[PDB]
C-alpha cells in the first residue's frame, strides 16, 4: 500500500486512509442504524472530477508517441468510470433508503475502484517520466563514447563545452528524482552514484588534457593518459547504468 513517489502519496494516501476509516464502520453486508445524509451533490463533484481526469488522459493517448501509455492508460479510464457509476448508484439508493446496506457496499467498492484506477494512471505517468530521465542518462553514456576520438585541444574545448552543461542537467534531474522517491535505500544509491559521476568528470577532462598534449611525443606519458581516460569513461558508464537500473526498481510493497 506504499506509494512509489511523494507526489503520488500526497494525492492518494489521504483517500486510502479515509476508505480504511469507513471500512472500520462498515464491513461487507453490515447493518447500522445511522442514516447517511443525501450524497447526490458530493458524488456529482466526484463524477465531474472523474470525467475531467479521463478527458486529460484521453488527450495524452491521442497525441503521445509512447506505446506503453497508449496501452496502459485506457484500462485505467474504464476502472475509474465503472467505480464512479457505483458511487452514483450508491447516492441514488441512499436517497430513498438512508440505511441501505447494498449502498454502503457500493460506497466502499466505488471508492476503492476510484483509488485503484487513479493509482494505475499515476504509476503509468510516473513510469513515462522515468523513461524520459533514462533517455537523458543514455545521451550522456553515448557522448562519453565520443571521448576516445578527441585528439586535439580544439576538439577537447568543444567536447567539454557540450558535456559540462549536459552533465549539470543530468545531475539536476537525478537530484529531483531522488527527492521524490519514498524508498530511502533507492535515494542513497542514486545520490552516491550521481556523486561518483560528478567527481569523475574533472578527472576525465584532466586525463583528456594530458592525452591530447602528449599524443605525438616519444618520451610522452600518452599511455598512462589513454589508460586513465578509458578507465574514467568505464567507471562513469558503470555508475550511470547503475542509476538507470535503480531508477526502475520497485519494492515488495505491494
Amino acid at each position: 500500500p506504499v506509494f512509489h513517489t511523494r507526489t503520488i502519496e500526497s494525492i492518494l494516501e489521504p483517500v486510502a486512509q479515509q476508505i480504511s476509516h469507513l471500512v472500520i464502520m462498515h464491513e461487507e453486508g453490515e447493518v447500522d442504524g445511522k442514516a447517511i445524509p443525501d450524497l447526490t451533490a458530493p458524488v456529482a463533484a466526484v463524477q465531474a472530477a472523474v470525467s475531467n481526469l479521463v478527458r486529460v488522459g484521453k488527450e495524452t493517448v491521442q497525441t503521445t508517441e509512447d506505446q506503453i501509455l497508449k496501452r496502459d492508460m485506457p484500462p485505467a479510464f474504464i476502472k475509474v468510470e465503472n467505480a464512479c457509476t457505483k458511487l452514483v448508484q450508491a447516492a441514488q439508493m441512499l436517497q430513498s433508503d438512508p440505511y441501505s446496506v447494498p449502498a454502503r457496499d457500493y460506497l466502499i467498492d466505488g471508492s476503492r475502484g476510484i483509488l485503484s484506477g487513479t493509482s494505475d494512471l499515476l504509476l503509468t505517468f510516473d513510469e513515462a517520466e522515468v523513461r524520459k530521465i533514462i533517455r537523458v542518462c543514455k545521451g550522456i553514456l553515448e557522448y562519453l563514447t565520443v571521448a576516445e576520438v578527441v585528439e586535439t585541444m580544439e576538439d577537447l574545448v568543444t567536447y567539454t563545452k557540450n558535456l559540462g552543461p549536459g552533465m549539470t542537467k543530468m545531475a539536476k534531474m537525478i537530484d529531483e528524482r531522488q527527492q521524490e522517491l519514498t524508498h530511502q535505500e533507492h535515494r542513497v544509491m542514486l545520490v552516491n552514484s550521481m556523486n561518483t559521476v560528478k567527481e569523475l568528470l574533472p578527472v576525465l577532462i584532466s586525463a583528456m588534457k594530458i592525452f591530447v598534449t602528449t599524443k605525438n611525443s616519444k618520451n610522452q606519458g600518452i599511455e598512462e593518459a589513454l589508460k586513465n581516460r578509458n578507465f574514467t569513461v568505464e567507471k562513469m558508464s558503470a555508475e550511470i547504468n547503475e542509476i538507470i537500473r535503480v531508477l526502475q526498481l520497485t519494492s515488495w510493497d505491494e
Binding site: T7, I11, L12, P14, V15, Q18, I19, H21, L22, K34, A35, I36, P37, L39, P42, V43, A45, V46, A48, A49, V50, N52, L53, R55, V56, G57, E59, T60, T63, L87, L107, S111, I114, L115, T118, L121, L122, F125
Partner: peptide, 27 residues
C-alpha cells in the same frame, strides 16, 4: 493540449473524494 495536466486532474479528483468521504463521516 496544455490547460490542465494529469497530476492537477488527479489532485482535483483526490479532493472531491476526500470531501465525499469526510461528508459520509460527519453523518
Amino acid at each position: 493540449g496544455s490547460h490542465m495536466n494529469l497530476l492537477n486532474a488527479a489532485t482535483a479528483l483526490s479532493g472531491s473524494m476526500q470531501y465525499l468521504l469526510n461528508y459520509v463521516n460527519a453523518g
